[PDB]
Design a protein around this ligand. Structure first.
Ligand SMILES: [Mn+2]
Length: 293
């Protein structure tokens, strides 16, 4: 494992071999941070074979902007990841606050603090803006934000991977690819839902890679885009086959018992892991099967 770096569009480990990370994301830490602890992460490492865990620290909706103490759960997750030898994504999970400039001063302060703490920790990956959305585009809105935040992180952490979200809920990776950041260790987020997104979205990804823009799927669901609507296993297989075909790392949404199809767990499932297959939802079962391979 160790230090990650990027060879062209390909994430590699410190040995210089290609690596395709696979894992699962928390739901918002202000609501479901109870599922995020050294016990549950260890169980995911050991039972599911995860090699990456995403700590989805919402900014809006009772998240870090209104109550910053949720940052202690991010640090808990990072310390768990270090002890367990897995990667951890620190995800500044914008959504209702769809332009990343809305909370930019607080993001910069947050990332200054995290890079300062974890700037020598190879476990950590920064995801600086989960899903830009609304009338928010790369050149005008998302790129200038990413430059300022990357500049902060790089003062403390010169080499860890930074993943930058793209327009239309991290769909418009082609627009990023036409105006790339210069940072040597940047990747662009692509998010999809198996019940909603299809070939048009793969073609955008293909276009971005052909331009040298690396892609990492920090969030995808087996559901349609609402997160409910049942599970689309055929489409999900087709998407994972496509990601495999390009060695694209991915992180499923989401580890929680929220009552909707994209949640991996059924209500009542332990907060500290050790789940029977009857504790897993249809999504959770599929996702776990695919991480194990
Ligand atoms: Mn580093």
């Amino acid at each position: 494992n160790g230090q990650l770096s990027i060879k062209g569009t390909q994430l590699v480990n410190r040995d210089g071999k290609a690596v395709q990370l696979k894992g699962i994301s928390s739901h918002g830490l202000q609501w479901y941070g109870e599922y995020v602890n050294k016990d549950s992460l260890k169980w995911l490492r050991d039972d599911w074979g995860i090699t990456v865990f995403r700590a989805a620290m919402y900014t809006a909706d009772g998240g870090y902007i209104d109550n910053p103490s949720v940052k202690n759960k991010v640090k808990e997750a990072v310390e768990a990841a270090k002890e367990l030898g897995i990667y951890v994504i620190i995800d500044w999970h914008i959504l209702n606050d769809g332009n990343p400039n809305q909370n930019k001063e607080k993001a910069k302060e947050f990332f200054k603090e995290m890079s300062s703490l974890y700037g020598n920790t190879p476990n950590v990956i920064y995801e600086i803006a989960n899903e830009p959305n609304g009338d928010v585009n790369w050149k005008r809105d998302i790129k200038p934000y990413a430059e300022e935040v990357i500049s902060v992180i790089r003062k403390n952490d010169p080499d860890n991977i930074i993943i930058v979200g793209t327009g239309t809920w991290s769909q418009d990776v082609n627009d990023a690819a036409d105006d790339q950041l210069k940072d040597a260790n940047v990747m662009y987020a692509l998010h999809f839902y198996a019940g909603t997104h299809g070939q048009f979205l793969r073609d955008k990804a293909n276009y971005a890679l052909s331009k040298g823009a690396p892609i990492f799927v920090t969030e995808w669901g087996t559901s349609d885009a609402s997160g409910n609507g049942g599970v689309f296993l055929d489409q999900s297989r087709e998407w994972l086959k496509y990601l495999d075909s390009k060695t694209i790392s991915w992180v499923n949404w989401n580890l929680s018992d929220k009552q909707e199809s994209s949640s991996a767990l059924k209500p009542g499932a332990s907060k500290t892991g050790g789940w029977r297959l009857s504790d897993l939802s249809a999504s959770g079962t599929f996702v776990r099967e695919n991480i194990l391979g």
